[PDB]
Amino acid sequence: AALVVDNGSGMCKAGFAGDDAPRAVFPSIVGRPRHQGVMVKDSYVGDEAQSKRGILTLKYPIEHGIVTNWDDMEKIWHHTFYNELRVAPEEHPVLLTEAPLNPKANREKMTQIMFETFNTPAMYVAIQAVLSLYASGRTTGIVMDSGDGVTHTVPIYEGYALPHAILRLDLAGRDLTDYLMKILTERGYSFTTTAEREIVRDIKEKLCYVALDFEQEMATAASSSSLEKSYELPDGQVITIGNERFRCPEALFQPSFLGMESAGIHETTFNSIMKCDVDIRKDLYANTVLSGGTTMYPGIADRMQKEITALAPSTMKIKIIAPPERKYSVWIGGSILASLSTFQQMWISKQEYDESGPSIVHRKCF
Amino acid sequence: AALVVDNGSGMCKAGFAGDDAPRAVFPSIVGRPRHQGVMVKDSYVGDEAQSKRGILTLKYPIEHGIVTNWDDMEKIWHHTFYNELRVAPEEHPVLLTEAPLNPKANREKMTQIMFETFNTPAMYVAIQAVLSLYASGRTTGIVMDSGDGVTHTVPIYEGYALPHAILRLDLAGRDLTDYLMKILTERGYSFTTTAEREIVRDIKEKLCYVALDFEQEMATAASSSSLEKSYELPDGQVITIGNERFRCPEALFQPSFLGMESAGIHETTFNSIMKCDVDIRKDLYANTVLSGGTTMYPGIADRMQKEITALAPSTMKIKIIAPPERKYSVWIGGSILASLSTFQQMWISKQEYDESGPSIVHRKCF
Amino acid sequence: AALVVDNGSGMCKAGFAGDDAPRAVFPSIVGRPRHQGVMVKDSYVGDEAQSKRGILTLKYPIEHGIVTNWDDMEKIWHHTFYNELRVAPEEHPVLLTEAPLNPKANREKMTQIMFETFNTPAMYVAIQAVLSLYASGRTTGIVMDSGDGVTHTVPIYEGYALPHAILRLDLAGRDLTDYLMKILTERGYSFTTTAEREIVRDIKEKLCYVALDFEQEMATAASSSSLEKSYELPDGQVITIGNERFRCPEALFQPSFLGMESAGIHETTFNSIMKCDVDIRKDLYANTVLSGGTTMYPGIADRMQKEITALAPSTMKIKIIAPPERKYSVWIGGSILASLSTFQQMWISKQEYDESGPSIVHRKCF
Amino acid sequence: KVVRQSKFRHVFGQPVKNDQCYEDIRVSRVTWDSTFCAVNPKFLAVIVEASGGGAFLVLPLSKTGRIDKAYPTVCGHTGPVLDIDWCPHNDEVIASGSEDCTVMVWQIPENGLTSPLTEPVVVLEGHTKRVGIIAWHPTARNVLLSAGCDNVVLIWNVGTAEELYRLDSLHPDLIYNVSWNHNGSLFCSACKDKSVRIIDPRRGTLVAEREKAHEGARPMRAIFLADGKVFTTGFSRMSERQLALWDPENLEEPMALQELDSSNGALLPFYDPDTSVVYVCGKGDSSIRYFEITEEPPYIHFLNTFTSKEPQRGMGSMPKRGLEVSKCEIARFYKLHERKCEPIVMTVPRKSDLFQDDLYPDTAGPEAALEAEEWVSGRDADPILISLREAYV
Amino acid sequence: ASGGGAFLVLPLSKTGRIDKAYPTVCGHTGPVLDIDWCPHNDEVIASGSEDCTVMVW
Ligand SMILES: Nc1ncnc2c1ncn2[C@@H]1O[C@H](COP(=O)(O)OP(=O)(O)O)[C@@H](O)[C@H]1O
Ligand SMILES: Nc1ncnc2c1ncn2[C@@H]1O[C@H](COP(=O)(O)OP(=O)(O)O)[C@@H](O)[C@H]1O
Ligand SMILES: Nc1ncnc2c1ncn2[C@@H]1O[C@H](COP(=O)(O)OP(=O)(O)O)[C@@H](O)[C@H]1O
Ligand SMILES: [Mg+2]
């Protein structure tokens, strides 16, 4: 019974190998009380923190795909094994996921905690981008992984990755949530505290969408009310948003909205494929696979295809692969890979690490 | 056995810890003679002042929850221990109550009085708002204590208070007693003395009620004698009142009747909830608790629920909790608190105070 | 003879271009009677409302930099043109100031009312933050703007603004004034009516100051009477305040005093600088400019400098610019800008607006 | 009678001002659960992260404020440093153990470090695995105890660089922590087998052993008390953190057993023999809990708790000699964040501004009672006590 | 209205709080300036907006 744990910047997905969906999906947040109790637990992790977020100060242990504080990070893992999965970590091998171009120091800390703090029998860590292609059942393609912390573009050809062509874009869902926060002020709605941030994130996940033509959508919203949508706040208040539904996701293609000099995802995909060899660009053009929760905006694939087609040569066949379950593509691929018979030799034993150290972890891993 | 003493602005309640009802309840009143003796005591307290009020001038030692005379207040306590509970103060630990956001200097004054002038062995102070929630068996909710001197609205969520959202209304039953005295003159009845004022209070506690619809009640009272009631004065004179039964309690919802531009009591609760976090307003709406002797008017809960519902969003469930014993929630909750085995830790001994002083008193305040 | 109008949350400043100081400065309030006239004007605006505030209900048409009532707001402008300035709005161009990141709809309503109601010949809208830098005679620097409703931090480099780095703080003079009431009640002084709010504001503007060391000031204030000051009420009563002089301004540095989850003013300024490019943080640290009436507290600049120094790297040279006339920096900068020869092309004519609409106003303005 | 008689029931914690802290410190990121900090009344030592090998930063106490990133450090180990300990009889001497299976002892200059320190005074190579436990002998001079991951306990004479004693066949699993007794004659050890062992080093015999002291599999600690008892902090079968008191003459059942919470993180206890107060801090916890140990049942009385909003990475305790006696301060705690060290002052509220004799009984001085050769013979002596009255101002 | 123009038409009996998502008469491409009920038809109303059109409902 191998455990597949996919820890992201904002979301954490966990479950058992062979399953078709993660069993535990809870926010990766740690909350602490900001007031003094008057009726006679100093921290809350996951859904309980979300349920009590009114009196708590929510903090993300991972920021931009970087562990800003490992002490809360261990709490997330401890909450996963004992409070979410309700299993003993020492009895199940654990499959881990790493961001592309993960620092060796980051992997070492992840490895050391797993074998020492939790005393896992065996464990392995795999690239999130590679696992996403496993779920799609493809051996060649370029996957853009846009989650909560950072967006990555990793091209893979015939099972070979190209690290030199891997591009990083410091722009993800959390930045959108902040962008939705700032643009909601012009409509008269004020959200400042960390508790309000989750509320704004819920609105983003429910009412935001990607417009095929941003300029035409702006004209439509300025001359009609058909794009208005209403959201009910937890206190029973209702708010209405218009152009902000498609303005917030537009930062994906126009980072200058956030003041970022970097280019959009559509171009960032184009530079990445432009960086690899000429003979493999054909397969990557027709094998663009979308992964991450930030890719659930409706119509993002259609806008994706139109943008790259303008950049790509006219003779070139552009195919954007957006499976409906790509939010858990990293976890789904991990469960598939862990269920393979030929994966048993990639496992790293606790005794082996105790005598060899993290050197064996840098090897056998990419 | 500990002592639970609640020296409210107009009503003083006390009794042994663990009892279901306070042992002694007497008015917080100090009377002094106003006529010359002609036959062969400078002050009286409570009942011994009440039974002799015909020849005495009555003074409340506390106004709007502010101590006006410490010496009379000390006399109140001295009468309380020896004449009401009839026990030695040094033989029992005492649990004491204070108004929300009570000034620390005021909290220090009674601390000095207890340990020095009464030589109490142990002592603790608790907020009256929290004690009410203890009686209701709740950890989350907004409690509305309307006493004789002042009214407060204290929201509590999961045992955590929000001092910034605490609102105070300078209106309570004593102001209503003056208003009833004012609105009884037009009916032809004159009451001016403090002894007469207490008579008005008895009429207020017996024949007043909160009308669900004030204007319709005005229309009904002006066209029928059904609402008419008769009160007998101590001299046997029968006093008949009509619309004043519900006109006086209307002052809580319409403070403009007293010339006060402050909002209605119902609105004060709404603003207190509005001042708190968005995510915890749902629990507060369904956990509104009425406390204090002012909240004994019949039909006040129904008028409360109707008014706030008109202010809250329609999707919110409004629940008003008005236990029949809520006249003594502060004392009853204290009896529960002092009965808890875990309560023994936050006791403060006389020796500790004598060597440390005020600092240990303001600290340990839960 | 252009007109310079600087409308804020609590203060409204008006005058003529080229003048060193505003000619008319009056409170931005609208008063209405709350009693019944018995002796044989339904609203009062500005100073006349202040003089008659004893029988009026004072309301601010702007709350947190948001116009809560445009009808009362038009009264402010009408009182400004005809009563205060005593000039014809249709004969002089008007320069208007708007808060940073002003919503488009808010400018349109301001634009519409000038051209259609007052029929001004020419009009222009400028950023309040930019005008403050105009008065300081600087082209590069971050300006913090704390007024009555909202505190803003705007960095400007070589005439270029960075909207993504603009930070907003919902804490200003009105919030401090309300906090003063809450702690003044602890001293036994009861201020509840809207008329007393101006009185509390007057005490704040006269006796409040920023302590360099907040905890040290408590220790001095708790062991001496040197920090004690007396204020005379309009009815001749004299009140005495101690530590409250510097406790109220501390909320700017410690928003937790008001229960706010946001950071203090110094960190917000620091965070705004950190959001900018690395190469431009050199000049912003040495060009911090204070503006708004909330920056008039004695010692606020030194406490500003000490706090930011602890956050910035030791190699960073910090300069806090607090000109003595910074209470009118927005108006003064507007007067200089309106007097520039190269400014006449910024004007927008009423005829052009009639044939084009507010589209020409969104462009040519930032 | 209503209130249990105590002098520390109202002790409150207060962090020092911002300018009095130490920032810009890259604290070590090693999963080993040690104090990560050693402080003496002259210097502050904190384990830091180095790209190559291991190092710990030693700075004077007066050097507050921001710390230069290029500040010289004690970088002598070829592997990451696991733990550090100041010499009680020499404030300028600190021992360090690292992952390079060696122990090196350093001599700090009086004014601090002007250049990075690489060469140590004495190197101890007796462990086949990483050494994460070091403990100076409370009384005997130049005596150091080292316990590596090889389940081997060694006694070293740093003055002569000689391994005095070797204890190997005594710990079947990994050892958590080791603490000397009052006179230095005995030491207690916590092992991964949930067994608490009291061992005589000079004789190499197991004095007492309690198996399955805590049923949880999480790491657990064990310390000696001044009166001669053992305080163990461990976990239950339901993963609940517990505090236990043990009598070395009777270990069949603990004297007390209280459960604190179900939170994770090992509980590091800090004992104050003068006040008989143990401060319990947990790794990654934002609160510090202190308890009083007395003969009255239940022998473990919870006093109060200082609560913060930030988890700590390690903990260092200031001995009595460096405390501000005039301010009625009984303990100082250097809370370590991920990039900052925040001293915390533990203060007894007292009205009188004069010296409090009861709060400050005679404390062990910085002079060793015996020497290594004398202690080897079997001599036993209590630590020499000094008077804190002179520190009053 | 965020885009175009509309006016709210509700029954007289429909009192109290009206939900924010109540359907409105949103046909004009510009904000509505004036509205007038037909005196001879209680179910007919004409509206004028900034789109230079008069539109009868
Ligand atoms: N339906 C949705 N629409 C838009 N964004 C979404 C949706 N669901 C999730 N997200 C965004 O995806 C982000 C996290 O996605 P994911 O990659 O699955 O987890 P992580 O990034 O933590 O690994 C969140 O920040 C959230 O804002
Ligand atoms: N049955 C009743 N009906 C109406 N008013 C009442 C009733 N009982 C008490 N009151 C009024 O409530 C007021 C406050 O009571 P209480 O809350 O006990 O005062 P406090 O708590 O401030 O001592 C009293 O002045 C009394 O006149
Ligand atoms: N001398 C002073 N000391 C403290 N606060 C002041 C002083 N003068 C003005 N203020 C505060 O400044 C606030 C408004 O300042 P200003 O920015 O000029 O007005 P507005 O916010 O309307 O633009 C007022 O709320 C007032 O309390
Ligand atoms: Mg992810």
Ligand SMILES: [Mg+2]
């Ligand atoms: Mg009361």
Ligand SMILES: [Mg+2]
């Ligand atoms: Mg202003």
